Structures are given as C-alpha cells and as structure tokens.
Amino acid sequence: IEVTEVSIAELRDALESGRTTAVELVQAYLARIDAYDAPGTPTALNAVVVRNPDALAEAQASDARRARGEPLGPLDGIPYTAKDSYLVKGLTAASGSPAFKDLVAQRDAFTVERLRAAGAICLGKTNMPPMANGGMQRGVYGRAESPYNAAYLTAPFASGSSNGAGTATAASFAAFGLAEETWSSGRGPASNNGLCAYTPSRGVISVRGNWPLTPTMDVVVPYARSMADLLEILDVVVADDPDTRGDLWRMQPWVPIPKASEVRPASYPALAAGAEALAGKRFGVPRMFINADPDAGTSESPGIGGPTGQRIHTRPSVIALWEQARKALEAAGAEVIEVDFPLVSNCEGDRPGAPTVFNRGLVSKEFLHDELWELSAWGFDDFLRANGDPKLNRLADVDGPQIFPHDPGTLPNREGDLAAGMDEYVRMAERGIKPWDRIATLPDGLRGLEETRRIDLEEWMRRLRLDAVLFPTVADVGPADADVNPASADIAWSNGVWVANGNLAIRHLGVPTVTVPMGVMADIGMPVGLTFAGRAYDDSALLRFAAAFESTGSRRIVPPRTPPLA
Numbered sequence: 001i002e003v004t005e006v007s008i009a010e011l012r013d014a015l016e017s018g019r020t021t022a023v024e025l026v027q028a029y030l031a032r033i034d035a036y037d038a039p040g041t042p043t044a045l046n047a048v049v050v051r052n053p054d055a056l057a058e059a060q061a062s063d064a065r066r067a068r069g070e071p072l073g074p075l076d077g078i079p080y081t082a083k084d085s086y087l088v089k090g091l092t093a094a095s096g097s098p099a100f101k102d103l104v105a106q107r108d109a110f111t112v113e114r115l116r117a118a119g120a121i122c123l124g125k126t127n128m129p130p131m132a133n134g135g136m137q138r139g140v141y142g143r144a145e146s147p148y149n150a151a152y153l154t155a156p157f158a159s160g161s162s163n164g165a166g167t168a169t170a171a172s173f174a175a176f177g178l179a180e181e182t183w184s185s186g187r188g189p190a191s192n193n194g195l196c197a198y199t200p201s202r203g204v205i206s207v208r209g210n211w212p213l214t215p216t217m218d219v220v221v222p223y224a225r226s227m228a229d230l231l232e233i234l235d236v237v238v239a240d241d242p243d244t245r246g247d248l249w250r251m252q253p254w255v256p257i258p259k260a261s262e263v264r265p266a267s268y269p270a271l272a273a274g275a276e277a278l279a280g281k282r283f284g285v286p287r288m289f290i291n292a293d294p295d296a297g298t299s300e301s302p303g304i305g306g307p308t309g310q311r312i313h314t315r316p317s318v319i320a321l322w323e324q325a326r327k328a329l330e331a332a333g334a335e336v337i338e339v340d341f342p343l344v345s346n347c348e349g350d351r352p353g354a355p356t357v358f359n360r361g362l363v364s365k366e367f368l369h370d371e372l373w374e375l376s377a378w379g380f381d382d383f384l385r386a387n388g389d390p391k392l393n394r395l396a397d398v399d400g401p402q403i404f405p406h407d408p409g410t411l412p413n414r415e416g417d418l419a420a421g422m423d424e425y426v427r428m429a430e431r432g433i434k435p436w437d438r439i440a441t442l443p444d445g446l447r448g449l450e451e452t453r454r455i456d457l458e459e460w461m462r463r464l465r466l467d468a469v470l471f472p473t474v475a476d477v478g479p480a481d482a483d484v485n486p487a488s489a490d491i492a493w494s495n496g497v498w499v500a501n502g503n504l505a506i507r508h509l510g511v512p513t514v515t516v517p518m519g520v521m522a523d524i525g526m527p528v529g530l531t532f533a534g535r536a537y538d539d540s541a542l543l544r545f546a547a548a549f550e551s552t553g554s555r556r557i558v559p560p561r562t563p564p565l566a
Contacts (some may be wrong), residue, residue: 002015003028004172004564005225008078008232011175015066015077016218022059022066022077022121029054029079029123036147036562043561047167047461048081049141050091050125055079058121065119075236076119081168082178083161084125084141085132085211087387088112095211096139097130099402106240108385109209111178111220114237126164132185132213133418135160136483138407146192146480146557147171149525153192153478157489158206158306158415158498160188162221169195169223171562174362176233177223181535182213183507184500186221189514190511191473191500194517194527194556195223196546201537202249203257206241209387212379215248215436216371216449217507227547227557229514243526245386246379248436249510254443257539265540270369277548279333281467282519286341287387288312288350289471290322295351302350304358306415306497309348312496314475317521318528322472324548325518328552339464342456347505355407357508362452367451377428378436395433401425409484414493453509460533460559468538470544473515473529474500501531514546517555525560 001020003011014020030185036043052058060375062077071077082088085095087105094100115122127144129137133158136143144167146154155163166189169177179186181199190197198221205220212218222237222363224230240261244250249257265271287293291314302309326336349356358365381395392398400423408414461469475496478513479485481493491497506513511533518530530549532542 008229015367020063026059045145046125047144047164049127072119079121079174081174087209096128098140099399109207110241118236128161132161143540147561157478157492161185162189166193179221181221187500191529197515199513201512215379234268260362271544272547275332281334284339284466307495309350310495312475317523320521367441377425396429467531468534475532514542514548519555
C-alpha cells in the first residue's frame with residue numbers, strides 16, 4: 001500500500017483488514033528512505049542517520065501477534081523514528097556528537113519503553129547537531145535538508161536540533177516521530193515542515209533516558225502530520241514513570257509537580273473537536289509577532305544576548321497566512337485580541353522599564369550561572385552513569401574537544417566558542433561535580449521560575465480573560481547556505497528566525513504549547529506553523545483548540561521533493 005500522507009488510523013485499519021502487514025509497512029517506509037534520504041540520491045535529505053537492524057524482525061513478531069488475534073493495542077505494528085538523543089536499546093546514542101559516536105544504549109528511554117510495550121517499531125534515529133546544543137550545525141552525521149525547498153533550512157539555525165525528525169516525519173519516512181526541545185528544538189522544526197507538535201507542561205512526560213542539555217528546560221516532543229495522529233501517540237506514551245532518575249522536575253521536592261496520570265485525560269483522541277470548540281473563546285495574539293509592536297527594542301540596551309529584545313521583522317507572506325488564520329478563528333465564533341506579551345518582554349528587557357531575567361530578582365544571577373554549568377555538567381555525567389555503557393560511563397572520560405567541534409569552512413557561531421564551551425564540562429567532571437540536590441541555588445531558582453510564570457502569564461491571562469495565546473511559530477526562515485553566506489547568516493541569526501518566537505522564556509518557565517500548520521508561504525513554498533500556548537497544566541484545552549483550528553481547513557501539503565514512489 002501507499003504510506004505517503006497516510007494517518008495512523010488508516011494504517012491500523014489496513015493491518016486489521018489484512019490489506020497489509022507490519023512487514024510490508026516497514027518495507028514501504030524503508031523504500032522511501034532509500035529513494036530520498038540516503039547519500040547518492042538526488043535529494044539526499046540525510047534525515048535518518050542510524051538504522052534499527054531489528055525492525056523487520058520486530059514487524060514479524062507484530063504480525064505473529066495479530067495472526068494469533070492478540071494485538072498489543074492501537075500502535076502495535078506502527079513504525080516511527082526517534083531523535084538521536086533518545087536511548088534505544090542496542091543502538092548507538094551519540095546525540096549527534098563525535099565524542100559519543102560509539103556510545104551504545106544499554107536500555108530504553110521511558111518514551112521508547114512505552115512504545116516498545118505497545119508494539120511500535122523504531123525504524124531508526126534522526127539527525128541533530130552535537131548535544132542538541134544548536135540548530136542546523138553539522139554534527140557527526142551532518143545535518144538534514146528540507147523536503148519542501150532545498151534553498152531554505154529545515155529548522156531555525158540556532159535552536160532547531162530536531163532537524164532530522166522534522167524532515168523525516170514530513171516526508172513520511174515513518175508514521176510519526178519523536179523529538180525534544182530545550183529552547184525551540186521542537187517547535188522550530190515542526191513549523192518549517194508543516195507538523196503538529198506538543199510541548200508538555202513540566203512532569204507530564206518523563207525525560208528519563210533522554211540526553212539532557214539543560215535539565216530545567218528539556219522536554220519530550222512528539223511529531224505528527226495531523227492532530228489525530230498526535231493524540232494516538234499521547235494516549236500510549238503519557239503515563240507515570242516509577243523511575244525518576246535524571247528527571248529533575250520529578251525528583252525535586254521544593255515545587256509541587258502533579259503526576260502524569262493526574263494531568264492527562266482519560267482519552268487523548270477524545271480531545272479532537274470541530275469549530276464549535278472555538279465559539280465564545282478569547283485568544284490573544286502578541287503584537288510583537290505580527291509586525292504591530294514599534295516599541296520592541298526601544299530600551300537603552302535591550303536583550304540578554306544574541307538578537308533577543310530586538311524588534312521582529314515578520315515576513316509579509318507569513319503575515320498573510322496569519323490574517324487568514326485570524327479570519328478562520330473569527331468565522332468559528334472566537335475573539336482574537338492583539339496584546340502585549342510580558343512573558344518575553346520581562347525576560348529580555350525590550351522596552352523602557354521592562355526588567356530582564358538577570359536583573360528582576362525573581363531568580364538569582366548565581367542560579368542562572370549554575371543552571372548553565374554545574375547543573376548541566378551533573379546532567380551529562382549522571383546520564384552516562386545511568387546508562388552504564390562499560391566502554392564510556394563517566395563524563396570525565398570523554399574527549400572534550402570532540403563534543404562539539406566547529407565545522408571547518410563555515411561562519412563562526414554567534415553565541416560564542418562552543419567547542420571550548422563544551423570542553424569545559426569535561427574539565428568540570430575532572431574537578432568533581434556536585435549532584436543536583438547539593439547545588440545551593442537550586443531551591444530558590446526552581447521556585448523563582450514558577451513565580452515568574454504565575455505573575456507574567458497565569459495571572460495576566462486571568463485578568464485578560466484569555467483562553468490561550470497564539471502566534472506564528474517563527475517570523476521567517478533562514479536560507480540553506482546560512483552556514484557560509486554572510487547575507488544569509490544575518491537573516492538566519494535575527495530575532496524571530498534564529499529561534500522560534502518566544503526565545504528562552506517559553507521553556508524556561510514551563511509553558512505548554514501546541515503547534516499546527518498555518519499554511520505555506522506563497523513566495524518560497526516553505527511551511528509555517530501556528531502555536532497555541534496557555535497556563536501550565538491546561539494542556540488538554542490547548543490540544544482541543546489546535547484540533548479545532550486544524551479542522552477549519554487543509555493547510556498541510558505533501559513535500560514536493562518526496563512524492564509517492566512509482
């Protein structure tokens with residue numbers, strides 16, 4: 001059968017009626033990978049970088065269960081891909097880093113455990129920059145290319161590390177995909193590839209067995225081509241993980257975090273709805289993301305580094321898609337209000353009187369320093385210890401200069417020297433790393449982060465009577481040669497483009513989001529998403545809003561570079 005642009009429900013229907021088998025499905029996806037992804041093909045998208053050699057045997061066992069009339073559940077026999085940061089037992093888990101190219105996973109990540117128990121089949125692992133500490137920079141496997149337009153990047157350049165997952169899921173190299181986000185490494189690639197994606201509130205999906213980057217910020221992010229598929233995934237993966245090791249927010253005792261089983265609904269697929277779910281709702285769109293905020297960037301020295309705090313120049317064709325999205329929401333009975341966005345303005349100090357996260361006093365400068373260094377060094381070292389690969393199980397034994405080497409011939413990283421930056425973590429391990437529960441600044445820091453969200457988002461949405469905040473996921477897309485072309489790098493590194501709209505505040509403060517396709521820019525053929533954000537633990541309502549918006553149109557297209565075969 002054809003698998004291009006086919007939904008999970010259609011696949012399960014085919015498996016149940018005998019129209020196909022799990023083996024036939026795996027072969028159909030591997031065929032697309034071999035025709036479009038592998039080196040030496042005309043497209044050479046280079047999205048899938050590590051194959052699962054047992055995939056066909058796993059498919060065999062799945063069909064044996066079905067012939068015996070006992071499928072494990074709705075995802076039995078459904079193929080997916082996982083970002084190279086996920087531990088998949090028996091395969092390498094380099095996190096795209098040359099220093100870890102031979103590290104082998106001794107167990108599964110929690111997400112993978114749930115999917116394995118459900119009979120889902122990992123076809124392989126997807127591309128990413130070293131340690132997810134970037135966007136489109138080339139790692140040990142290079143980088144992935146866009147299936148929509150070879151001239152533009154498949155993700156934001158500075159934070160879009162799930163760049164293989166975005167290409168692979170949009171090109172139907174599997175039914176769905178698994179990604180991860182620290183700044184915008186989840187929302188970014190979803191936007192450029194027309195995907196649905198969900199960034200959960202804190203503690204909803206265990207991050208055990210996932211390569212950490214910043215333990216206060218890392219979250220799991222599922223990718224799918226439709227909201228219905230996204231809900232199929234969540235139904236299976238969202239559950240309580242009895243093992244808390246490595247998951248900072250589920251280990252810490254100072255901030256109340258609810259159990260996953262307390263946050264999820266009884267049934268995720270039941271969250272789908274039509275336009276009726278938008279009637280009478282109030283949605284606020286930040287002026288700063290629709291070219292309506294002349295005050296952005298008008299303080300004396302705005303930002304907290306890079307292009308932050310600067311006025312965002314949104315592409316005209318993205319504005320045109322936003323206006324149609326607004327009309328669709330209003331036609332469905334919703335109210336869309338242009339508003340400020342304190343969450344970002346008070347993090348980046350972008351206008352007179354606005355504080356920054358560094359000078360506001362809700363979190364201390366020393367906590368922000370420990371977050372970047374001491375806590376992250378502990379994250380790396382404890383992940384290696386927990387995995388327990390006999391050949392490499394301590395951060396102090398790592399080849400520092402090889403963690404994130406610079407790609408020769410490309411322009412410098414505007415965030416600084418990241419090869420030396422990452423090497424410092426090994427020097428730290430050699431001096432001795434304090435565990436997380438002995439870092440003195442942590443208690444006040446975690447409470448300060450939650451306090452910031454309460455003031456800037458939750459109480460703010462109450463007085464405005466907003467049901468959600470929404471905006472284009474990104475302001476523009478960087479050209480594909482932003483790594484070597486100065487003019488292209490200037491665009492790719494500008495605010496709203498280097499990182500998805502929201503910069504660091506979204507993940508730093510634990511804001512749940514859902515992203516769906518907003519359409520395709522008419523001038524360059526690149527997709528752009530619409531992001532819904534809301535109060536912590538309002539995830540269910542946000543998923544429903546996204547599903548309802550999706551139902552009002554058909555805003556996704558098959559990538560023109562990866563058509564159905566034959």
